[PDB]
Amino acid sequence: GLASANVDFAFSLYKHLVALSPKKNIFISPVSISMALAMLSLGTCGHTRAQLLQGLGFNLSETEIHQGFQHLHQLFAKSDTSLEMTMGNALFLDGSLELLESFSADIKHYYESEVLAMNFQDWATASRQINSYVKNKTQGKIVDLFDSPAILVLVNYIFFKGTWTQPFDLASTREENFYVDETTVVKVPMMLQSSTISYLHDSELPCQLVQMNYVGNGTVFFILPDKGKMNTVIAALSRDTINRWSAGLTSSQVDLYIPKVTISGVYDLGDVLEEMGIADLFTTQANFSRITQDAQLKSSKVVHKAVLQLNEEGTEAAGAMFLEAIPRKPIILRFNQPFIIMIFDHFTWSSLFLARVMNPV
Numbered sequence: 001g002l003a004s005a006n007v008d009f010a011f012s013l014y015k016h017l018v019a020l021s022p023k024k025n026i027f028i029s030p031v032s033i034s035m036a037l038a039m040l041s042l043g044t045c046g047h048t049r050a051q052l053l054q055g056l057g058f059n060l061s062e063t064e065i066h067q068g069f070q071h072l073h074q075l076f077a078k079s080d081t082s083l084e085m086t087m088g089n090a091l092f093l094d095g096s097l098e099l100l101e102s103f104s105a106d107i108k109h110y111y112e113s114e115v116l117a118m119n120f121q122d123w124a125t126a127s128r129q130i131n132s133y134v135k136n137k138t139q140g141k142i143v144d145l146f147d148s149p150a151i152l153v154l155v156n157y158i159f160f161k162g163t164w165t166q167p168f169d170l171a172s173t174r175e176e177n178f179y180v181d182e183t184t185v186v187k188v189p190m191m192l193q194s195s196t197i198s199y200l201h202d203s204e205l206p207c208q209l210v211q212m213n214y215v216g217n218g219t220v221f222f223i224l225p226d227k228g229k230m231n232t233v234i235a236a237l238s239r240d241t242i243n244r245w246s247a248g249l250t251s252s253q254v255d256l257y258i259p260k261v262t263i264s265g266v267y268d269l270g271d272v273l274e275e276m277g278i279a280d281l282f283t284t285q286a287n288f289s290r291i292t293q294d295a296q297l298k299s300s301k302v303v304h305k306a307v308l309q310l311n312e313e314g315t316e317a318a319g320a321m322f323l324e325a326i327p328r329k330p331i332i333l334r335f336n337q338p339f340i341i342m343i344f345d346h347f348t349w350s351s352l353f354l355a356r357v358m359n360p361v
């Protein structure tokens, strides 16, 4: 099924990226990556198609996959007083190219994708056009997404605004030490609430964790590993671990200290995808025959960018992907050191956002 395959891709992508850049702040939107690459698969055939779908975790009909993302795209459109969420897709195309009927019909039906004309000869204008488009769609959260000129650009964006069901106490906020390294300490606004919170001191892993809900169906896990045990906890991240945590989490009195995190990241997913076995996309042997017949295309660059804001009232997260194609007693829990964030949807089981916070500033 889609829900199982998507979350397994989420953790594997996270793990591989963590290993590739071990000191960087990692904040990603796996569902964004899965939806963008699944939309791409509609334009692939042969060995490239099979390799992409298998890498995404799908047992190779294709219609089941795209109906699944159509389902997600619909449920992820919300605009209320305490909950706001949007998700979308777009295709930027040079005038020299024309999409095949079935491909453009499929991306518009299943992914509600806009197909927008573009002059790749003027890259300054082109990259300005795409950057502003993404900027507006994510409510100004994703700024300056754009690397090298390209005749086709595939885009996906996600914006999320959640409100804590248990908000942090504004008066309780103080500046605390956040210990980045053995030689690095930064000052950060540290939030505090003393509430009945779902808590688990893990006995099978060197970590302690809490679960908090947002107004609606959004939920978040904050995982604090024991000092120097970040990679032992990360390697264990799976469906079986999150299930056991969910079953283990018990209502407890917690003095919960989490910092006011404002982080961003830009990630070239080239090395990550090829580590996961998705390699044909980038080769001069790439099969992109269902996109267009006006040119044989390969992928030149795959980039993801995401931003995270945490405060006393809630969370504001946003993400964007682009693909360029060219011609072929209270328990004190203090998050004052590197920790893990997992934002999920209760309703669909979708991994919305994953984080490894090395430095909240």
Ligand SMILES: C[C@]12CCC(=O)C=C1CC[C@@H]1[C@@H]2[C@@H](O)C[C@@]2(C)[C@H]1CC[C@]2(O)C(=O)CO
Pocket: 003, 004, 005, 007, 219, 239, 242, 243, 246, 344, 345, 346, 347, 349, 350
């Ligand atoms: C593994 C699981 C069910 C099987 C599956 O294919 C996908 C997932 C990933 C997300 C998990 C989910 C369930 O376990 C319920 C979880 C933990 C959910 C995230 C939040 C959740 O809904 C709860 O926290 C339950 O209250």
